[PDB]
Design a protein around this motif. Structure first.
Motif, PDB file in Angstrom:
ATOM      1  N   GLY A 146       0.778  -1.304   0.098  1.00 46.24           N
ATOM      2  CA  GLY A 146      -0.145  -0.048  -0.194  1.00 46.24           C
ATOM      3  C   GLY A 146       0.825   1.248   0.084  1.00 46.24           C
ATOM      4  N   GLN A 147       2.240   1.278  -0.233  1.00 44.67           N
ATOM      5  CA  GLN A 147       3.029   2.494  -0.165  1.00 44.67           C
ATOM      6  C   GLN A 147       3.242   3.023  -1.521  1.00 44.67           C
ATOM      7  OE1 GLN A 147       3.133   4.138   2.491  1.00 44.67           O
ATOM      8  NE2 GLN A 147       4.342   3.003   4.271  1.00 44.67           N
ATOM      9  N   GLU A 148       4.356   3.312  -2.066  1.00 43.24           N
ATOM     10  CA  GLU A 148       4.651   4.034  -3.218  1.00 43.24           C
ATOM     11  C   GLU A 148       3.903   3.219  -4.409  1.00 43.24           C
ATOM     12  OE1 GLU A 148       5.526   6.915  -6.069  1.00 43.24           O
ATOM     13  OE2 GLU A 148       5.538   7.118  -3.751  1.00 43.24           O
ATOM     14  N   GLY A 149       3.344   3.501  -5.168  1.00 45.41           N
ATOM     15  CA  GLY A 149       2.736   2.671  -6.531  1.00 45.41           C
ATOM     16  C   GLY A 149       3.455   2.813  -7.648  1.00 45.41           C
ATOM     17  N   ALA A 150       3.944   4.024  -8.023  1.00 44.98           N
ATOM     18  CA  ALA A 150       4.633   4.160  -9.472  1.00 44.98           C
ATOM     19  C   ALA A 150       5.958   3.623  -9.117  1.00 44.98           C
ATOM     20  CB  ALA A 150       4.838   5.530  -9.563  1.00 44.98           C
ATOM     21  N   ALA A 151       6.512   3.100 -10.525  1.00 46.54           N
ATOM     22  CA  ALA A 151       8.023   2.662 -10.623  1.00 46.54           C
ATOM     23  C   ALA A 151       8.958   3.259 -10.656  1.00 46.54           C
ATOM     24  CB  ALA A 151       7.767   1.331 -11.823  1.00 46.54           C
ATOM     25  N   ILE A 152       8.899   4.525 -10.790  1.00 48.10           N
ATOM     26  CA  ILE A 152       9.931   5.553 -10.710  1.00 48.10           C
ATOM     27  C   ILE A 152      10.295   6.249  -9.516  1.00 48.10           C
ATOM     28  CG2 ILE A 152       8.451   7.575 -11.281  1.00 48.10           C
ATOM     29  CD1 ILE A 152      11.330   6.973 -13.616  1.00 48.10           C
ATOM     30  N   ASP A 153       9.381   6.354  -8.607  1.00 49.70           N
ATOM     31  CA  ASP A 153       9.799   6.829  -7.205  1.00 49.70           C
ATOM     32  C   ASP A 153      10.699   5.848  -6.539  1.00 49.70           C
ATOM     33  OD1 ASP A 153       7.465   8.687  -8.065  1.00 49.70           O
ATOM     34  OD2 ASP A 153       8.229   9.736  -6.149  1.00 49.70           O
ATOM     35  N   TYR A 154      10.457   4.443  -6.704  1.00 51.14           N
ATOM     36  CA  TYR A 154      11.091   3.395  -6.429  1.00 51.14           C
ATOM     37  C   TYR A 154      12.361   3.514  -6.886  1.00 51.14           C
ATOM     38  CZ  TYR A 154       7.362   0.655  -3.950  1.00 51.14           C
ATOM     39  OH  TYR A 154       6.296   0.096  -3.358  1.00 51.14           O
ATOM     40  N   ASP A 155      12.646   3.923  -7.845  1.00 48.78           N
ATOM     41  CA  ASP A 155      14.110   4.102  -8.372  1.00 48.78           C
ATOM     42  C   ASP A 155      14.719   5.245  -7.884  1.00 48.78           C
ATOM     43  OD1 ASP A 155      13.825   1.750 -10.338  1.00 48.78           O
ATOM     44  OD2 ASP A 155      12.986   3.372 -11.881  1.00 48.78           O
ATOM     45  N   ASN A 156      13.863   6.379  -7.431  1.00 49.31           N
ATOM     46  CA  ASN A 156      14.500   7.606  -6.984  1.00 49.31           C
ATOM     47  C   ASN A 156      15.000   7.215  -5.426  1.00 49.31           C
ATOM     48  OD1 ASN A 156      14.951  10.083  -5.780  1.00 49.31           O
ATOM     49  ND2 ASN A 156      12.455  10.066  -5.050  1.00 49.31           N
ATOM     50  N   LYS A 157      14.042   6.379  -4.702  1.00 57.43           N
ATOM     51  CA  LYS A 157      14.437   6.042  -3.285  1.00 57.43           C
ATOM     52  C   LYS A 157      15.315   4.903  -3.495  1.00 57.43           C
ATOM     53  CE  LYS A 157       9.689   6.438  -1.491  1.00 57.43           C
ATOM     54  NZ  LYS A 157       9.275   7.236  -2.448  1.00 57.43           N
ATOM     55  N   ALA A 158      15.706   4.149  -4.298  1.00 55.69           N
ATOM     56  CA  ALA A 158      16.885   3.278  -4.594  1.00 55.69           C
ATOM     57  C   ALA A 158      18.110   4.135  -4.783  1.00 55.69           C
ATOM     58  CB  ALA A 158      16.624   2.342  -5.836  1.00 55.69           C
ATOM     59  N   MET A 159      18.038   5.324  -5.364  1.00 50.40           N
ATOM     60  CA  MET A 159      19.305   6.019  -5.519  1.00 50.40           C
ATOM     61  C   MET A 159      19.699   6.738  -4.182  1.00 50.40           C
ATOM     62  SD  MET A 159      19.848   5.806  -9.063  1.00 50.40           S
ATOM     63  CE  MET A 159      20.317   7.243  -9.922  1.00 50.40           C
ATOM     64  N   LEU A 160      18.617   7.139  -3.483  1.00 51.19           N
ATOM     65  CA  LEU A 160      18.514   7.670  -2.028  1.00 51.19           C
ATOM     66  C   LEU A 160      19.368   6.487  -1.313  1.00 51.19           C
ATOM     67  CD1 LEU A 160      17.936  10.070   0.067  1.00 51.19           C
ATOM     68  CD2 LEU A 160      16.038   8.679   0.325  1.00 51.19           C
ATOM     69  N   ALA A 161      18.771   5.460  -1.267  1.00 52.02           N
ATOM     70  CA  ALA A 161      19.415   4.322  -0.469  1.00 52.02           C
ATOM     71  C   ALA A 161      21.041   4.032  -0.789  1.00 52.02           C
ATOM     72  CB  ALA A 161      18.604   3.099  -0.489  1.00 52.02           C
ATOM     73  N   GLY A 162      21.130   4.255  -2.000  1.00 54.83           N
ATOM     74  CA  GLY A 162      22.678   4.018  -2.482  1.00 54.83           C
ATOM     75  C   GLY A 162      23.746   5.027  -2.010  1.00 54.83           C
ATOM     76  N   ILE A 163      23.140   6.321  -2.076  1.00 51.05           N
ATOM     77  CA  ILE A 163      24.182   7.363  -1.387  1.00 51.05           C
ATOM     78  C   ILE A 163      23.969   7.311   0.015  1.00 51.05           C
ATOM     79  CG2 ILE A 163      23.636   9.104  -3.492  1.00 51.05           C
ATOM     80  CD1 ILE A 163      21.713  10.528  -1.610  1.00 51.05           C
ATOM     81  N   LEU A 164      23.119   6.846   0.991  1.00 49.00           N
ATOM     82  CA  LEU A 164      23.072   6.384   2.086  1.00 49.00           C
ATOM     83  C   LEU A 164      24.130   5.471   2.461  1.00 49.00           C
ATOM     84  CD1 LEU A 164      19.631   7.122   4.112  1.00 49.00           C
ATOM     85  CD2 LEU A 164      21.629   8.517   3.780  1.00 49.00           C
ATOM     86  N   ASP A 165      24.092   4.348   1.679  1.00 48.20           N
ATOM     87  CA  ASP A 165      24.935   3.193   1.975  1.00 48.20           C
ATOM     88  C   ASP A 165      26.426   3.850   1.598  1.00 48.20           C
ATOM     89  OD1 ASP A 165      26.193   0.680   1.695  1.00 48.20           O
ATOM     90  OD2 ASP A 165      26.225   0.819  -0.346  1.00 48.20           O
ATOM     91  N   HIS A 166      26.954   4.552   0.539  1.00 46.71           N
ATOM     92  CA  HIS A 166      28.144   5.357   0.433  1.00 46.71           C
ATOM     93  C   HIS A 166      28.518   5.976   1.617  1.00 46.71           C
ATOM     94  CE1 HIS A 166      29.767   4.389  -3.619  1.00 46.71           C
ATOM     95  NE2 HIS A 166      28.453   3.679  -3.671  1.00 46.71           N
ATOM     96  N   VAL A 167      27.625   6.661   2.262  1.00 47.19           N
ATOM     97  CA  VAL A 167      27.839   7.359   3.545  1.00 47.19           C
ATOM     98  C   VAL A 167      28.060   6.739   4.835  1.00 47.19           C
ATOM     99  CG1 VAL A 167      26.987   9.020   5.376  1.00 47.19           C
ATOM    100  CG2 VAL A 167      26.252   9.593   2.939  1.00 47.19           C
ATOM    101  N   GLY A 168      27.431   5.379   4.808  1.00 47.00           N
ATOM    102  CA  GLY A 168      27.693   4.485   5.673  1.00 47.00           C
ATOM    103  C   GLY A 168      29.006   4.003   5.814  1.00 47.00           C
ATOM    104  N   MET A 169      29.306   3.581   4.530  1.00 47.34           N
ATOM    105  CA  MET A 169      30.646   3.016   4.398  1.00 47.34           C
ATOM    106  C   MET A 169      31.756   3.662   4.757  1.00 47.34           C
ATOM    107  SD  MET A 169      29.957   0.840   0.736  1.00 47.34           S
ATOM    108  CE  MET A 169      30.564   2.324  -0.131  1.00 47.34           C
ATOM    109  N   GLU A 170      31.705   5.055   4.333  1.00 45.50           N
ATOM    110  CA  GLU A 170      32.419   6.001   4.744  1.00 45.50           C
ATOM    111  C   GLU A 170      32.716   6.258   6.111  1.00 45.50           C
ATOM    112  OE1 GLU A 170      34.697   7.516   2.776  1.00 45.50           O
ATOM    113  OE2 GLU A 170      34.896   9.701   2.789  1.00 45.50           O
ATOM    114  N   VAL A 171      31.599   6.482   6.876  1.00 44.57           N
ATOM    115  CA  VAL A 171      31.661   6.431   8.228  1.00 44.57           C
ATOM    116  C   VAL A 171      32.429   5.234   8.798  1.00 44.57           C
ATOM    117  CG1 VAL A 171      30.386   6.288  10.339  1.00 44.57           C
ATOM    118  CG2 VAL A 171      29.624   7.755   8.642  1.00 44.57           C
ATOM    119  N   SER A 172      32.458   3.989   8.421  1.00 47.61           N
ATOM    120  CA  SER A 172      32.809   2.764   9.133  1.00 47.61           C
ATOM    121  C   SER A 172      34.163   2.786   8.875  1.00 47.61           C
ATOM    122  CB  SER A 172      32.187   1.507   8.474  1.00 47.61           C
ATOM    123  OG  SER A 172      32.769   0.891   7.307  1.00 47.61           O
ATOM    124  N   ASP A 173      34.729   3.136   7.442  1.00 43.33           N
ATOM    125  CA  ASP A 173      36.147   2.931   6.810  1.00 43.33           C
ATOM    126  C   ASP A 173      36.973   4.212   7.770  1.00 43.33           C
ATOM    127  OD1 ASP A 173      38.002   1.792   5.901  1.00 43.33           O
ATOM    128  OD2 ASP A 173      37.915   2.826   3.819  1.00 43.33           O
TER     129      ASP A 173
END
Ligand code: SF4
Ligand code: SF4
Ligand code: SF4
Ligand code: SF4
Ligand code: NI
Ligand code: NI
Lengths: 763, 393, 170
Positions: A146-173
């Protein structure tokens, strides 16, 4: 505080404009894994033919949601790793230690680019982790029905998750490099031995599997303090091995720990019987380790809350009692979350267990192999169940006569998953048979790999800037990712050697570095000792584990900062646009299987860095591909006057999967071309791309003329004949008396032009 | 051609295991040379070998080697000889089994057995070199070579080579700003720094240490409309601060309004911009009113307490900031070295290795006056050091 | 030999809908009746037997070849019209009816698959068969579920015999 960009601490809405701008050109292509959704109890819903489920979500939305879930899972495993490591480091060393990384004006390019903060102490990384968690939680809330319905905002949120992943990797390293004495931007990191043939069976052998190094540091501290380094072998599988080999190695002294291999080696090593104790931490650990260690009397010790393995929790018990219980066979392992007691229990357990289990292995003898080979009927189930599509029935039939070369060939390609053995009605340990057939290769399996250097310093980037501008360095090639290779662990080595011979910049990390360092030439030298380890042309550098991948991406950010004076703080869109339009750098994950690799690739894409994945990565359910034939897709703005500018179709993808390492080489060479290249850079890139295409595909590329805007944009050795080909086949007008192009190119040459994808940066 | 020509062979090294001959080398006599001749003194596509050819050789033996190129055309001038010589090296390393090292007279040449078996004569190799030179520099429309192999002929050309090298060095040292009409502009770095414009004059070398006034002259000759171009000086607005009107309107045109004035040989008055590629960075010390210089290779701190990366991160991107200046090493050997601020009379700090490298530049009296890190570890220490030795500042 | 339908076993399934197991006669008829067919060829055709079989098949009916991967060097000397294209790109382009094609004459309606990996061609066909209307015929060794029509599971000799029998009916 200095100048802040338009996007500090981004959310789903804050990065939607840049993501949609990117998706306008590089459209998402969805390759669903199923025709069904199995999320809520309204289903499972059939979605074949782009049909919608009971919630209205269609097939494209489901594929986008699945890829988004993969991305957030990977981001959550570097962030949890980072938080746990940072909390332990703060508890031990205090929260006011200045960040010690090397010699660079910008210490944390990813953190400063995303959050806008400028950390200076280990206690200043705490807020960033809180943000990285908080947004992460919101992202997971979108996986609900029942959350996001379109397939393009899912891609946008995926890119946001990717940049957050890079931030977390940087912090850990950053935390681990500052605290645990890792090399600090060292272009001369020590060489460590790798391979199954390095461990010696005479001494007790400890095997550490996982990613975290908090407990392994205690183990090696105990080993050094009690003087057991020469009387015991310590080895690591996966990135935890890199973390040990970087530990206290800023003194540039060779270490005693040894890297065994990647994940694909794990079961094989267990089947070898060499380990006397296996200690697991968390990420990338086979779930059937006790199921084999009980047969081979190998104790299993867990050290993390994430991976307890259904084992008894002896955290509060005495070490001697646990040792006695494991020795007498009461339990096959234990969860030991107390690091101080674990660091003593593990070496003592190895010492007390080695004499009682020496000589036990799953490898068959000669007569047992003969019987097992003669038992097969060639029913074809093992070949069906093999993930790598290996000809197992043919190999066994050839081995029936006595030709064990087919299984020796299969050993390199096999990833040691034993999935074949579960579909054999004759109950043949096929993996053990292949290992016995390749015993000689396993014995002679040694190599050298350079230790993790950390992050690239400012001086090296500044020195290489002139080489990039003057057309001496064609581009940057990063070789990262997992070890789910389709044709063995030699393709990464071949690609790296091919691109190093042509004076590219090769940066490696993860299991790919291990598998690159496992092969030598005739002189018996690996690539790491054949080429230097600095950040320059013809050099291969190792950043370390996957958490060091951020450094790679971080390096690109500094190219936008130290050269164009761009502000990094909270300016994701501007820096990403600069990197996409000007920097020639391509990543390659030849064996990506895990969600961490998907998150890293997505984060690299959001920063403007294209990546090429292995064929198996087609199962990730998403790629980013551009329409070359659509001439209206390739149009940008001119930052000088806001005019409309045309750019050549490069890069033609953000994420795509290659099939063979030759096609991967051609794609990597082609996609290093950028619209902002001067004459010399364009000339060298075109030369290398055309030569590689002729070498591997056997033909001259069909679209090379799209990148020729100037007579000085052609290879020096083959200029006149290329000019003739332009004139005859296309009608371009060439000044044959001056060797100059009079007319014909669609895009004129103007080095002062500033292409951009953002309207707000013009005039 | 019997052998493939490609830059990917640049990194190949011919070890003695596969080496067939070692022409010239670091033991025997070796030389490379490019001469400018009139159009009637050159015959194109001519390779002349004096002494033994490649057939009359011995595997493993070293023979004297001297390559002398006669180049000529209409725009070719003797001052552009050295520029041509600089590319020779690269154009030799494009070949498959040929290895070239050093330049001038320290040259080192090696040929592998595999390529020796393919290219029987020295003729196709010379032809490939000539074609590469003609493609690279279109204005050279006549080229020929002579390959001297005997010791007698090599020794005969050696004296002429040394004499013309001395003459070339004298010429390039004597050239200055008032004895030239054009200043050569370069914008190659505009690929990464969109608002960076470089001006090269005999007394102001490029900030990357790779383009001289002659290099820019040749590059502008090849492509007048390319990233390297020639600009007329125009009115001399300021002799002390090297300010010319031509550079002013060129900066106004090609800097998008980021700066409307470039003052050569100045530090705090509209200094020359720089992208990211400084061989050396200059910083101000306002407590002692001094100038400190730090090279890229330095791994230590400064009396200000800042390394090279941190200081160089506050200068560049094409922005005309004041307080730091990115310069090449050869700028120290210029008589107009920051002449608008006092020249060397304002320098108060250099790292030890930099001072040893550029000791020729510092005057003999001030050689002791300049303070290094071997004696100064602070800023109070620098103040006392300048107090004791009576620095001109 | 003639029988290419007796084995359609799979390890994992994409869903309820699956490709039809066809015979050599049906495969030859479908290839010879296509209005605009494209021969999508992977690098598994580099096997010499498969190489000349594919060359003969392309010559018989004048079918342009898309040599995905690194299979182009096997078509440089053979007198055919083969062009290189990335399989993931080609699959993306096939779903767009406005793509001019490998020769600029428009999109295709039927593709023929030979010499791929069953985990890569299946992934590409997952997009192709769900977001387009292009039909696929798999003349490969493995049973491709995501195609429209496919051969069964055959051995090397059986596959060679089936390809021959197709070539004779072409
Ligand atoms: S989430 Fe939607 S598509 Fe999935 S099972 Fe539930 S109703 Fe069906
Ligand atoms: S599953 Fe077992 S019996 Fe069947 S072919 Fe494979 S090894 Fe032979
Ligand atoms: S263990 Fe090796 S041979 Fe067996 S299914 Fe897995 S990859 Fe294939
Ligand atoms: S630094 Fe050198 S290469 Fe760059 S623009 Fe200036 S002169 Fe040209
Ligand atoms: Ni520069
Ligand atoms: Ni610069």
């Amino acid at each position: 505080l200095g100048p802040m960009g338009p996007t500090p601490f981004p959310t789903a809405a804050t990065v939607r404009d840049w993501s949609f701008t990117l998706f306008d050109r590089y459209e998402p292509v969805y390759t669903p894994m199923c025709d069904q959704c199995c999320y809520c109890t309204f289903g499972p819903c059939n979605l074949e033919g782009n049909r919608r489920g009971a919630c209205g979500l269609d097939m494209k939305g489901q594929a986008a949601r699945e890829f988004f879930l993969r991305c957030i899972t990977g981001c959550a495993c570097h962030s949890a790793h980072g938080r746990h490591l940072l909390d332990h480091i703060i508890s031990i060393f205090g929260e006011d230690m200045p960040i010690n990384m090397g010699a660079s004006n910008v210490i944390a390019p990813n953190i400063q680019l995303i959050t806008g903060r400028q950390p200076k102490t280990l206690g200043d990384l705490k807020p960033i982790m809180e943000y990285v968690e908080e947004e992460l939680g919101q992202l997971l809330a979108t996986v609900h029905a029942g959350q996001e319905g379109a397939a393009i905002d899912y891609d946008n949120k995926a890119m946001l998750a990717g940049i957050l992943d890079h931030v977390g990797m940087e912090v850990s390293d950053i935390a681990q490099v500052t605290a645990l004495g890792f090399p600090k931007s060292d272009p001369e990191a020590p060489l460590v031995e790798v391979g199954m043939g390095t461990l010696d069976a005479s001494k007790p052998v400890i095997i550490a599997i996982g990613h975290n190094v908090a407990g392994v540091t205690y183990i090696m501290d105990y080993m050094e303090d009690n003087n057991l380094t020469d009387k015991m072998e310590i080895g690591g599988l996966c990135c935890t091995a890199f973390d040990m080999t970087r530990y206290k190695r800023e003194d540039r002294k060779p270490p005693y720990a040894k890297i065994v291999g990647t994940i694909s080696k794990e079961l094989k090593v267990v089947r070898s019987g060499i380990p006397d104790v296996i200690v697991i931490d968390e990420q990338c650990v086979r779930a059937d380790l006790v199921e084999e260690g009980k047969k081979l009397k190998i104790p299993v010790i867990a050290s993390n809350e994430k991976v307890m393995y259904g084992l008894p929790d002896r955290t509060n018990d005495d070490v001697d009692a646990i040792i006695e219980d494991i020795k007498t066979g009461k339990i096959p392992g234990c969860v030991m979350l107390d690091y101080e007691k674990l660091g003593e229990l593990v070496p003592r357990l190895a010492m007390e267990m080695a004499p009682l289990r020496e000589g036990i292995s799953a490898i068959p003898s000669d007569e047992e192999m003969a019987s097992l080979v003669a038992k097969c009927v060639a029913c074809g189930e093992c070949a069906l169940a093999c993930p790598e599509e290996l000809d197992i029935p043919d190999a066994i039939q050839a081995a029936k006569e006595g030709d064990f070369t087919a299984l020796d060939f299969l050993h390199d390609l096999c990833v040691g998953c034993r999935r074949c053995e579960q579909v054999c009605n004759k109950e043949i340990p096929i993996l053990s048979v292949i290992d016995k057939a390749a015993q000689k290769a396993i014995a002679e399996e040694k190599g050298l790999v350079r230790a993790g250097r950390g992050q690239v310093s400012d001086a090296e980037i500044r020195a290489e800037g002139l080489n990039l501008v003057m057309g001496t360095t064609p581009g940057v090639i990063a070789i990262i990712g997992c070890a789910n290779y389709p044709a063995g662990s030699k393709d990464v080595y071949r690609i790296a050697e091919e691109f190093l011979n042509r004076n590219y910049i090769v940066a490696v990390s993860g299991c790919s570095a291990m598998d690159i360092g496992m092969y030598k030439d005739a002189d018996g030298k690996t690539l790491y000792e054949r080429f230097p380890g600095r950040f320059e042309r013809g050099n291969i550098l190792n950043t370390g584990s996957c958490v060091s991948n951020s450094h790679i991406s971080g390096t690109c950010h500094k190219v936008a900062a130290i050269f164009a004076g761009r502000n990094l703080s909270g300016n994701l869109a501007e820096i990403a646009d600069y990197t996409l339009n000007r920097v020639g750098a391509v990543g390659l994950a030849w064996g990506a299987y895990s969600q961490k690799a998907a998150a890293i690739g997505t984060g690299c894409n959001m920063y403007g860095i294209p990546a090429v994945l292995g064929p198996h990565s087609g199962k990730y359910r998403r790629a980013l591909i551009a329409k070359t034939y659509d001439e209206n897709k390739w149009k940008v703005y001119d930052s000088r006057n806001g005019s409309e500018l045309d750019i050549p179709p490069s890069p033609e993808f953000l994420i795509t999967t290659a099939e063979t390492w030759q096609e991967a080489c051609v794609l990597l060479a082609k996609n290093c071309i950028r619209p902002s290249d001067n004459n010399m850079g364009r000339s060298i890139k075109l030369t290398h791309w055309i030569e590689l295409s002729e070498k591997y595909l056997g033909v001259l590329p069909e679209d090379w003329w799209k990148f020729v805007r100037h007579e000085a944009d052609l290879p020096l050795s083959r200029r006149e004949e290329l000019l003739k080909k332009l004139e005859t086949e296309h009608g371009w007008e060439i000044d044959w008396k001056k060797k100059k192009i009079i007319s014909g190119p669609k895009i004129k040459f103007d080095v002062s032009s500033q292409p951009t994808n953002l309207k707000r940066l013009c005039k | 051609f019997p052998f493939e020509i490609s830059p990917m062979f640049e990194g190949e090294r011919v070890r003695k295991e596969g080496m067939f001959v070692e022409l010239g080398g670091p033991k025997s006599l070796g030389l490379e040379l490019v001469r400018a001749k009139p159009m009637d003194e050159i015959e194109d596509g001519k390779v002349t070998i004096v002494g033994p050819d490649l057939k009359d050789m011995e595997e493993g033996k070293t023979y004297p080697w001297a390559m002398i190129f006669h180049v000529g055309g209409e725009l070719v001038e003797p001052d552009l000889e050295s520029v041509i010589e600089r590319r020779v090296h690269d154009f030799i390393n494009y070949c498959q089994g040929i290895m070239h090292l050093n330049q001038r007279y320290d040259v080192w040449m090696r040929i592998s057995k595999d390529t020796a078996a393919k290219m029987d004569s020295f003729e196709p190799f010379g032809k490939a070199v000539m074609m590469l030179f003609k493609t690279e520099l279109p204005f050279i429309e006549k080229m020929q070579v002579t390959f001297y192999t005997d010791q007698a002929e090599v020794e005969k050309q050696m004296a002429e080579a040394m004499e013309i090298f001395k003459a070339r060095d004298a010429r390039t040292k004597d050239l200055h700003d008032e004895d030239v009409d054009v200043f050569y502009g370069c914008t190659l770095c505009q690929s990464f720094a969109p608002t960076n414009v470089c001006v090269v004059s005999p007394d102001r070398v490029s900030l990357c240490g790779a383009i001289n006034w002659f290099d820019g002259r040749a590059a502008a000759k090849v492509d007048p409309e390319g990233p390297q171009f020639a600009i007329e000086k125009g009115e001399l607005l300021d002799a002390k601060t090297g300010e010319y009107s031509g550079v002013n309107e060129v900066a106004k045109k090609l800097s998008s309004g980021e700066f409307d004035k470039i003052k050569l040989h100045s530090f705090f008055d509209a200094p020359h911009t720089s992208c990211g590629c400084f061989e050396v960075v200059g910083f101000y010390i306002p407590e002692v009113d001094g100038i400190g210089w730090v090279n890229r290779e330095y791994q230590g701190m400064a009396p200000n307490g800042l390394g090279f990366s941190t200081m160089a991160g506050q200068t560049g991107g094409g922005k005309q900031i004041v307080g730091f200046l990115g310069i090449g090493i050869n700028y120290f050997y210029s008589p107009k070295f920051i002449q608008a601020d006092g020249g060397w009379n304002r320098v108060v700090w250099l790292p030890s290795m930099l001072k040893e490298k550029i000791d020729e530049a510092i005057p003999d009296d001030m050689k002791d006056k300049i303070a290094t890190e071997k004696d100064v570890t602070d800023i109070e220490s620098l103040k006392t050091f300048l107090k004791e030795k009576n620095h001109p500042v | 030999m003639v029988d290419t339908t007796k084995n359609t076993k799979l390890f994992t399934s994409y869903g309820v809908k699956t490709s039809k197991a066809i015979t050599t006669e049906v495969a030859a008829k479908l290839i010879s009746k296509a209005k605009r067919p494209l021969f999508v060829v992977g690098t598994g055709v580099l096997d010499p037997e498969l190489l000349d079989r594919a060359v003969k098949i392309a010559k018989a009916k004048n079918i342009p070849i898309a040599a995905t991967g690194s299979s182009m060097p096997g078509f440089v000397d053979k007198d055919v019209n083969a062009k290189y294209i990335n399989l993931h790109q080609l699959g993306f382009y096939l779903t767009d009816p406005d793509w001019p094609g490998l020769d600029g004459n428009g999109n295709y309606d039927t593709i023929i698959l030979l010499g791929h990996k069953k985990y890569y061609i299946n992934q590409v066909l997952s997009a192709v068969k769900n977001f387009s209307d292009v039909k696929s015929i798999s003349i490969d060794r493995n049973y491709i579920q995501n195609a429209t029509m496919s051969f069964g599971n055959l051995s090397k000799a059986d596959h060679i015999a089936a390809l021959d029998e197709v070539i004779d009916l072409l």
